[PDB]
Amino acid sequence: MGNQQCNWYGTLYPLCVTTTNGWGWEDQRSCIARSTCAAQPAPFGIVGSG
């Protein structure tokens, strides 16, 4: 697979690649755009380390 996550200043959100054009809502929850998701600075960024 190859999904990215949003270490949101501490919280965790699923990345909305289609809504990567800003904040979006998918997965029956809130998804944060691509970069807005991970691109953010640390410790913000792409999460998903199983």
- What H or E segment, with its residue span, contains residue 35? helix 34-37
Q: How far apart are CA 35 and CA 44, in angstroms?
A: 10
What is the full DSSP assignment across 3-20? Answer: --EEEEBTEEEEB-STTT
Answer whether 35's CB lies under 8 Å from 21's CB: no
Answer whether 24's CB lies under 8 Å from 16's CB: yes
Asked whether the bond before 41 is cis by omega within 30 degrees of 0, the reply is no
Q: How far apart are CA 41 and CA 4, in angstroms?
A: 15
Domain residue spans of the chain: 1-50
Answer whether 16's CB lies under 8 Å from 2's CB: no
Contacts of 1 (CB under 8 A, 6+ apart): none
Q: Locate breaks in the chain with C to N over 2.5 A; list the residue preceding each.
A: none
CATH of 1-50 given 1.10.3210.10, 2.60.40.10, 2.60.120.280, 2.30.32.30? 2.30.32.30
Contacts of 23 (CB under 8 A, 6+ apart): 16, 30, 31, 32, 33, 36
